Design a protein around this ligand. Structure first.
Ligand SMILES: O=C(O)[C@@H](Cc1ccccc1)[C@H](Cc1ccc2c(c1)OCO2)C(=O)O
Ligand SMILES: [Zn+2]
Ligand SMILES: [Zn+2]
Ligand SMILES: [Zn+2]
Length: 220
């Protein structure tokens, strides 16, 4: 009895997909990803938690006729990578940074078929940019920017009311990383967090506040 996959339009050619999963002791957690349409080409930004929701998601666009050209995962946790296996079984290219691929293999999980590195990677020139702001939520977390719509996909890095799961976090790097991201993408119109709804650049500033706060708090 878990909630159904949501598919909602956010902007022209940009959809938010919402999937739900019970997570440890935190109850049912919503997780936001995007599907970015580049004409007839569809790109998943993070997979749903599960293979089933990934199939549902893909079949929903395949059914309306688009070509799934690829998937990019913003960090190694299964709320970003849960459907990589299923995609791979269907010949859909999957992408992750080399670091993200190293952590997947280290946890006994299937890896993306295509890796990248460098602070900046373009999945699609002048359309989908992949950016590494430095450790935060995880050592490997990256963000995805959509220049043509001014939409920034923040992932589990963006945490405007509390940092969430610190199990793999780097509290000491987060403020710096938060500040850089803040500077770089200060002018996004929309900011899409993994576990909060879409807001504006204010969430960049709140994330920075939480990391700073989170930091002192663990110092005492
Ligand atoms: O670490 C994560 O990505 C989420 C938990 C998780 C871990 C491993 C596989 C799937 C899911 C976690 C979800 C979460 C958990 C607790 C939170 C929260 C968000 O915001 C406030 O409190 C997060 O992103 O921080
Ligand atoms: Zn995570
Ligand atoms: Zn998360
Ligand atoms: Zn939502």
């Amino acid at each position: 009895s878990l909630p159904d996959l949501k598919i909602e339009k956010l902007d022209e050619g940009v959809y938010v997909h919402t999937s739900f999963e019970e997570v440890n002791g935190w109850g049912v957690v919503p997780k936001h990803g995007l599907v970015v349409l580049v004409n007839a080409e569809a790109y998943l930004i993070d997979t749903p938690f599960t293979a089933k929701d990934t199939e549902k998601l893909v079949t929903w666009f395949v059914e309306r006729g688009y070509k799934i050209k690829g998937s990019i995962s913003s960090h190694f946790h299964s709320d970003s990578t849960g459907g990589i296996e299923w995609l791979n079984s269907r010949s859909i290219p999957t992408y992750a940074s080399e670091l993200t691929n190293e952590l997947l293999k280290k946890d006994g999980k299937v890896q993306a078929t295509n890796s990248f590195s460098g602070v900046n990677y373009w999945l699609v020139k002048n359309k989908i940019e992949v950016f590494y702001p430095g450790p935060g939520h995880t050592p490997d977390n990256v963000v995805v920017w959509l220049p043509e719509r001014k939409i920034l996909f923040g992932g589990c890095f963006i945490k405007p009311y509390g940092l969430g799961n610190l199990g793999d976090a780097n509290i000491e790097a987060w403020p710096k990383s938060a500040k850089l991201l803040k500077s770089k993408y200060g002018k996004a119109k929309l900011v899409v967090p993994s576990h909060s709804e879409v807001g504006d650049a204010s969430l960049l500033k709140l994330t920075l506040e939480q990391a700073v706060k989170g930091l002192n708090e663990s110092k005492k």
